[PDB]
């Protein structure tokens, strides 16, 4: 019983972290094969808008310090891959796992391996918000911390940490170097989009609440998908369209989605001092897939 935000075990990814230092800047890189991926602002000499193509034109390969532990890697060449640098190094990472890249979509969960000085320090699960930010814990030096999912032995890399918005939201890029949410790796004012709770995830959390015996909030009443959706776009929640991933949940609890959707409206306002699985507010960080593996295996 119980539900917790979990990370997948990080062992396979910890052996791929390297420390990338250039000038007065230090951050983390991802060493796979003979390439090191890191945020391109490691080569920024500053406040004002950075011209990255110029920074790369004046690069001096020998002022790079790349190391895995106390093993230093010689830099062979450096090219721009969107918001990342692709650094070919003279050594192959022998512990490179089987891996792929995938760009995650709003509402999907993945794991952050939080890194500092080129070493993993913490691991936690996150969920991509509708404004393409994550609710992270990163301080200066954390850029380049990778985000990953592990499927059937293969590591799917989906995130390298980049920046913190002035509101505390965190932003990374995918491994192709495309910034999530289109934010710019510039030290400038840019305000994030509004953020709407991911209703399907909220449903997953309430089904898990039912599976664990939390039922005081359950509506006797109901509301059709459509009538809910017209209410969602005025109350900070996403619409629902497909209720078919909840079929197996509806069967194991006997509670259908329209009943939960009515509970959601009632619970959006307040919990009334009560709690659901320790929470006093609706949370959209749990996906149906997460709930299934925890409640059943």
């Amino acid at each position: 019983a119980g539900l917790r935000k979990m990370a997948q075990p990080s062992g396979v990814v910890e052996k791929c972290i390297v420390r990338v230092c250039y000038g007065n800047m230090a951050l983390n890189g991802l060493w796979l094969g003979d390439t090191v991926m890191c945020p391109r602002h490691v080569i920024a000499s500053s406040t004002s808008t950075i011209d990255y193509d110029y920074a790369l034109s004046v690069l001096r390969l020998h002022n790079f310090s790349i190391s895995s532990g106390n093993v230093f890697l010689g830099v062979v060449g450096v090219t721009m891959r969107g918001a990342l640098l692709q650094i070919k190094v003279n050594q192959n990472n022998v512990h490179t796992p089987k891996y792929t890249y995938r760009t995650v979509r709003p509402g999907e969960s993945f794991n952050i391996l939080a890194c500092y000085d080129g070493a993993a320090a913490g691991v936690y699960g996150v969920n991509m918000r509708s404004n393409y930010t994550i609710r992270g814990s990163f301080i200066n030096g954390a850029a380049g911390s990778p985000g990953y999912n592990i499927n059937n032995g293969t590591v799917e890399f989906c995130y390298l940490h980049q920046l913190e918005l002035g509101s505390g939201c965190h932003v990374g890029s995918d491994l192709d170097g495309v910034m999530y949410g289109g934010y710019e790796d510039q030290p400038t004012l840019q305000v994030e989009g509004a953020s709407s709770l991911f209703t399907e995830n909220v449903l997953a959390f309430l089904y898990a609440a039912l599976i664990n015996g939390s039922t005081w909030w359950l509506s006797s009443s109901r509301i059709a998908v459509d009538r809910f959706n017209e209410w969602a776009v005025h109350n900070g929640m996403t619409t629902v369209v497909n209720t078919d991933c909840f079929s197996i949940f509806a069967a194991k609890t006997g509670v259908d989605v329209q009943r939960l959707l009515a509970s959601i409206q009632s619970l959006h306002k307040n919990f009334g001092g009560k709690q659901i699985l320790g929470y006093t507010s609706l949370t959209d960080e749990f996906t149906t897939g997460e709930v299934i593996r925890q409640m059943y295996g």
Binding site: P39, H161, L163, E164, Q186, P187, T188, L189
Partner: peptide
């Protein structure tokens, strides 16, 4: 206001 970490 955006901080490059």
């Amino acid at each position: 206001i955006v901080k490059l970490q």
